[PDB]
Write an enzyme that holds these catalytic residues in place. Structure first.
Site, PDB file in Angstrom:
ATOM      1  N   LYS A 168     -21.492 -18.157  81.951  1.00  0.00           N
ATOM      2  CA  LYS A 168     -21.127 -18.622  83.350  1.00  0.00           C
ATOM      3  C   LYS A 168     -21.766 -17.263  84.286  1.00  0.00           C
ATOM      4  CE  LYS A 168     -17.456 -18.283  81.621  1.00  0.00           C
ATOM      5  NZ  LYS A 168     -17.184 -18.020  80.125  1.00  0.00           N
ATOM      6  N   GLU A 219     -13.273  -9.055  85.375  1.00  0.00           N
ATOM      7  CA  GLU A 219     -14.161  -8.681  84.157  1.00  0.00           C
ATOM      8  C   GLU A 219     -14.667  -7.361  83.900  1.00  0.00           C
ATOM      9  OE1 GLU A 219     -15.906 -11.289  81.841  1.00  0.00           O
ATOM     10  OE2 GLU A 219     -13.470 -12.422  83.409  1.00  0.00           O
ATOM     11  N   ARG A 220     -16.208  -7.869  82.881  1.00  0.00           N
ATOM     12  CA  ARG A 220     -15.890  -6.846  82.368  1.00  0.00           C
ATOM     13  C   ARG A 220     -16.845  -5.564  83.529  1.00  0.00           C
ATOM     14  NH1 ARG A 220     -18.206 -10.955  80.081  1.00  0.00           N
ATOM     15  NH2 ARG A 220     -17.236 -11.204  77.926  1.00  0.00           N
TER      16      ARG A 220
END
Lengths: 490, 466, 467
Positions: free
Chosen positions: C154, C180-181
């Site tokens: 993604k 997210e990260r």
């Protein structure tokens, strides 16, 4: 005369590691409190008429009516180089019989991960000494890489070979190349942890390793806490220009301990009875593994969390939760294990999200396209299963793939230096193994590696120092493998 | 002092105390019962009221009924005079032979041996059972688990091990019957009297028996394993002697816990289990262990609900074991006894540095050929063996012979097999499977390898056929 | 007006007000904190008590602690001064570059544009990505979704799209990092400085950044998407120029809602989700749109829990999109990247009247051959290739070449592939698949088609594979 229920309280009820407490009006969320008997607990539920306290120990030591007293702050642990070579519990207490742990520094367990700014891209190799890992799914310093698979697929063994691998660097005098190790055991049995420690001591690896152990008979709060406490010990190195590696063995058992606590605090269950924020439990822990920019010391903390699957379902809820946190995963399978594929790594299903940036140029040279190539090989192998007329190109693809598969097989407790790995992979990737019987590849590798260690230390040392294969080294390697192969075929 | 019952539902009884509240784990004595009824304090509910778990039936209890605090957890007789005797969960003699006059008692709750007390000694315990000795060997002082669905062979296997290990063993044994058949206890007891391992006339008995079977309410079934452990703990520590501990069946401990948890009103966990499944199991299992002070070789039969090894009960048990023998219904139905799954049974001592490279190589070689046969099952089930390549046909033929050579007549199962029981030396097991893998018996019919001892019997059997 | 904290359980904080009770959605300020801690009002429980969701950690909070009603929802900086900067949920700078030099603010909660404000314009947006352009092309001003399970691609794809579309964009872009990260946030930030799309010294920055990653408590993760899109709404409405909005990952908005749902006193719906999943999503998604006032091309990464596309979160997302790119682990596992499922990716503009008959015919031809092969695979795996008719084994070999020619080396994936990245014009994409379908490369090996750009590289690779 006492009316002050601001700094103290009274146990209303006690059961299954949960004390409900009256009073404690001034208690903070997540504050450690102390019971009459000496036991400690964390104030996780602050409700209008009570405080829900999780107990760090045996609740037989708590009774209705017992006083509860404020400590003033959240949990913290001993921190520093004094923990190296020591086995401690979830709070850093010495459990190895070697004497009290005396550090000059302490650190909180529940600190938030560094944000965007204190960080810099992962770029330094964290060598496992495992050919398949270092070449196909490379780990860098500051990375999180999951180890995942069913029971008895070889998960711990990856982490153990990795710890033992660091001795090569740690015996030296270059502090920026060293890697200090932390093994966190969660929910394991004590005898297993003891055998683990015996292994690390025999390999002379314990001296740079901290073992943090919250075992199966430790209360659920201690098992829940152990990963964070180990993480705090590792963040010491990270924030002081040093490099640490932390293993969480395993996070499946931590999630189970946390599920218990949560259900007993009467927090309503979600998927699979796990608490609604089971993702957040692991994501806050694993985000704390990071690579720091030079402003913050340039240090790092690398994490290898472990997840146990059931019936090999990598696509399950909790597994994909943790896969969705880490910067890649090493997926191990029983099928591969018993086929003789050890380490039992599924190539197509394993990934690294850092890639070649975490490799030496030498490794990047020999393994640059190998992962996608081996993924394609397994597809073609499955498709060509029936002996139907195949073209030369597909046959070559099959020949190469079969031989590289044999090359990535590796034993235990002898993690390989990077220049040695490059040398063996070189023989495979350059096509010298293509005419050999698949069954004789391991024989070739054993004989070839021992030869270059014996006679060509100048070449290996040059690959290790330069970190690359120069045109001179490439010509030397070419001459060696050609003549060696000509002898091996006869 | 005295409490009064305020609530009763099955095994769970709430008791209110006017002066002084019993701590958690204390044994309470219900007044006015014909036979001793113990309530174990589980929780403090508040308002001077405790929640307890009954060790026997609660029928006939009335609200307001008096309850006394014994001032201690359940305490049981421990020592040499438990040998030859049968006791229940609360340490009462149930063999009609009078008092168990031990010099000491012990609480059934003790803390697990600490990390510092662990032994790292790993020595092979040869069973004479081919599958086990070859692929997943047991260790002396090790934790052994026998996994199986209903009727597949757990108890027969534990009984064969008592036959093969205990007589060669120099020490004491403890058998804990946990939630299993009362008539199986009757069988074991009287067979031990017949053989003389229990002597009713002398102090020469070598086995202590503890029973809480499937006729018992869940409180008794949840605690009886602890009773068994406590008896073994004494022999391990206060005698520093080699102990064998046999438990049939440890799943029943966890199942009983599920029944009480439902009555305690906990929010349930996955598959309807107690949220405390793993910690409860850990606190119990961590006591079943060898220490630097003494050896316990433990063998626990482990029931598998609906044959589902991923069920939280058996799934959580695996990590508590050093060797696992996993039985398979599919294998039993093919006629292979013992019905061991050779690709799902493991041992920590399956290591070339421990068993030697020869043992290790033959074991892994056997497993490779079996796995190669396994991942052809899809195609074989549809088209049969005749569609496979010559290469694959060779691996199928040898794997099928190996599968059969892994079967073995048990001394204990003679009525069912029709064959005299066999015990095979380790060296002979290694040699037999070594020869098959090498193709030395490729010419012999598969059925020759079925239900024999050493490889020579397979040769002799084939000679009678052709 | 002033309240007192009466309860704290994780991210959920109850506050009692003796007088002026704050309305739902209001932002409350906890007093006595070192760093600003915002609570958002979620419910009125009764008894003068509101239930709130915290925007930061709740450690250290005390029953009795004073809380001020700000008299409004969370308000954040908008306008051109957000460009080249990084902001958090509540509008604070997190880039160590001092204050956001602005004084125009906007509430993160807003009504969705009405039905009358909708635009029906839909023209192709070429990506240079063969599989996307051929089978399920994106539209300018349209809603694009990138579905995938954990680790299937993604983010790599969204980064490639930013590389192929945003670097040569005529307007502004907003990237919203949602659950997210943090490492990915740092990667992207320094990459855009290196490319010049962010400039730290002049005012030529093209992209505004908003982040609340998986290190944050659920309240933050539940609201960062609203913050990110608020920045986008300003650029759309007050300007009228075209905007690109990238979100990674929009699932995390729904996940955060599910994390706090039980503590907000809700009975669970199916699969442990909040009963409000679909209306929650609707009120957020319906703001992410092109209007008659201005265009938003939105690209949202969409996580698929346990790889199950029927999971309520992704399942409810499909209806909000005009183009769907569905990634598959089954495909990634084969080394086929990008791991796009050609038989589960769709687009509103995949219509012969929009893309032309040539484009449409080749796309449907590719899908047909692949569906025919998929249906055969399992039969031939057991009964064998030799049992197939000549017509069937021709469709097999061509299908396998087509599967491979859909794979492509991305510039942003060079660290993973070992191949130089490639961008393929739509004209070349159509021609290439046309020729394979027509049997023009039946004589070439399978692998020649794997991991290349234009069809000329497959021919060249086939020649190289000979010797």
């Amino acid at each position: 005369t006492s009316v002050d229920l601001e700094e103290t309280g009274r146990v209303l009820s006690i059961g299954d590691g949960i004390a409900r407490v009256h009073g404690l009006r001034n208690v903070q969320a997540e504050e450690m409190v102390e019971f009459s008997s000496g036991l400690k607990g964390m104030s996780l539920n602050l409700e209008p008429d009570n405080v829900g306290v999780v107990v760090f120990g045996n609740d037989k030591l708590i009774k209705e009516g017992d006083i509860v007293k404020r400590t003033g702050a959240i949990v913290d642990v001993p921190v520093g180089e004094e923990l190296l070579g020591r086995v401690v519990d979830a709070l850093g207490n010495a459990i190895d019989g070697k004497g009290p742990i005396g550090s000059k520094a302490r650190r909180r367990v529940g600190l938030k991960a560094p944000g965007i700014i204190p960080r810099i891209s992962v770029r330094e190799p964290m060598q496992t000494g495992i050919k398949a890992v270092d070449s196909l799914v490379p780990i860098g310093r500051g990375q999180r890489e999951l180890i995942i698979g069913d029971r008895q697929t070889g998960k711990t063994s990856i982490a153990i070979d990795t710890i033992i691998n660091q001795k090569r660097f740690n015996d030296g005098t270059d502090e920026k190349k060293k890697l200090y190790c932390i093994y966190v055991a969660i929910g394991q049995k004590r005898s297993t942890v003891a055998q683990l420690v015996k292994r690390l001591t025999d390999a002379d690896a314990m001296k740079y390793t901290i073992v943090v152990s919250a075992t199966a008979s430790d209360a659920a709060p201690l098992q829940y806490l152990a990963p964070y406490s180990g993480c705090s010990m590792g963040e010491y190195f990270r924030d002081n220009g040093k490099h640490a590696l932390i293993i969480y063995d395993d996070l499946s058992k931590q999630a189970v301990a946390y599920r218990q606590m949560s259900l007993l605090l009467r927090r309503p269950p979600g998927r699979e009875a796990y608490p609604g924020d089971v993702f957040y439990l692991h994501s806050r822990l694993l985000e704390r593994a990071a690579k720091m920019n030079d402003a913050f010391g340039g240090g790092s903390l690398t994490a290898l969390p472990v997840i146990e699957t059931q019936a090999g379902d990598v696509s399950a809820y909790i597994p994909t939760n943790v896969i969705s946190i880490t910067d890649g995963q090493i997926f191990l399978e029983t099928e591969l294990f018993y086929k003789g594929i050890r380490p039992a790594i599924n190539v197509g299903l394993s990934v690294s999200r850092v890639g070649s940036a975490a490799q030496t140029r030498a490794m990047k040279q020999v393994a640059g396209t190998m992962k996608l190539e081996l993924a394609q090989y397994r597809e073609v192998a499955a498709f060509a299963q029936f002996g139907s007329d195949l073209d030369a190109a597909t046959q070559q693809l099959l020949s190469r793939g079969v031989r590289l598969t044999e090359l990535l097989k590796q034993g235990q407790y002898s993690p390989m230096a990077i220049e040695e790995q490059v040398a063996v992979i070189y023989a495979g990737v350059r096509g010298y193994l293509d005419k050999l019987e698949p069954s004789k590849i391991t024989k070739f590798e054993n004989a070839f590696l021992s030869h270059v260690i014996s006679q060509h230390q100048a070449l290996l040392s040059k690959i290790r120092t330069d970190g690359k294969i120069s045109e001179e080294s490439d010509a030397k390697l070419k001459e060696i493998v050609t003549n060696f192969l000509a002898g091996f075929e006869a | 002092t005295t409490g009064r019952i305020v609530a009763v539902i099955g095994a769970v009884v709430d008791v209110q105390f006017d002066e002084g509240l019993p701590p958690i784990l204390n044994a309470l004595e219900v007044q006015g019962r014909e036979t001793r009824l113990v309530l174990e304090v589980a929780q403090h509910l508040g308002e001077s009221t405790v929640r307890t778990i009954a060790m026997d039936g609660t029928e006939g209890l009335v609200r307001g009924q008096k309850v006394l605090d014994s001032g201690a957890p359940i305490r049981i007789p421990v020592g040499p005079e438990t040998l030859g005797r049968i006791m229940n969960v609360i340490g009462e003699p149930i063999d009609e032979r009078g008092p168990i006059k031990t010099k000491q008692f012990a609480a059934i709750h003790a803390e697990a041996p600490e990390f510092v007390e662990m032994s790292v000694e790993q020595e092979i315990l040869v069973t004479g059972i081919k599958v086990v000795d070859l692929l997943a060997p047991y260790a002396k002082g090790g934790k052994i688990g026998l996994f199986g669905g209903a009727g597949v062979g757990k108890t027969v296997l534990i009984m064969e091990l008592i036959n093969n290990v205990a007589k060669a063993h120099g020490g004491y044994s403890v058998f804990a019957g946990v939630g299993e058949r009362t008539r199986e206890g009757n069988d074991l007891y009287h067979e031990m009297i017949e053989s003389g391992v229990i002597n009713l006339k002398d102090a020469t008995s070598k086995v202590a028996l503890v029973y809480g079977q499937m006729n018992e309410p869940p409180g008794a079934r949840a605690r009886v394993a602890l009773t068994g452990l406590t008896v073994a703990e004494y022999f391990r520590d206060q005698e520093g002697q080699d102990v064998l501990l046999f438990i049939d069946n440890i799943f029943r401990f966890t199942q009983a816990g599920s029944e009480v948890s439902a009555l305690l009103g906990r929010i349930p966990s996955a598959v309807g289990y107690q949220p405390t499944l793993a910690t409860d199991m850990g606190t119990m299992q961590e006591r079943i262990t060898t220490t630097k002070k003494g050896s316990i070789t433990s063998v626990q039969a482990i029931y598998v609900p609906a044959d589902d090894l991923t069920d939280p009960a058996p799934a959580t048990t695996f990590a508590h074991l050093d060797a696992t023998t996993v039985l398979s219904r599919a294998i039993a139905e093919l006629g292979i006894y013992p019905a061991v799954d050779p690709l799902d049974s493991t041992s920590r001592i399956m290591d070339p540095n421990i068993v030697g490279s020869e043992h290790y190589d033959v074991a892994r070689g056997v497993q490779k050929i079996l796995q190669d046969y396994k991942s052809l099952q899809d195609i074989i089930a549809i088209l049969g063996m005749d569609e496979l390549s010559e290469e694959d046909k060779l691996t199928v033929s040898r794997a099928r012979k190996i599968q059969r050579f892994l079967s073995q007549p048990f001394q204990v199962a003679e009525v069912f097999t029709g064959h005299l029981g066999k015990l095979v030396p380790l060296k002979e097991t290694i040699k037999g499977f070594q020869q098959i893998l090498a193709g030395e018996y490729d010419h012999l019919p598969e059925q020759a390898f079925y239900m024999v001892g050493p490889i020579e019997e397979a040769v002799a059997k084939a000679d009678k056929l052709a």
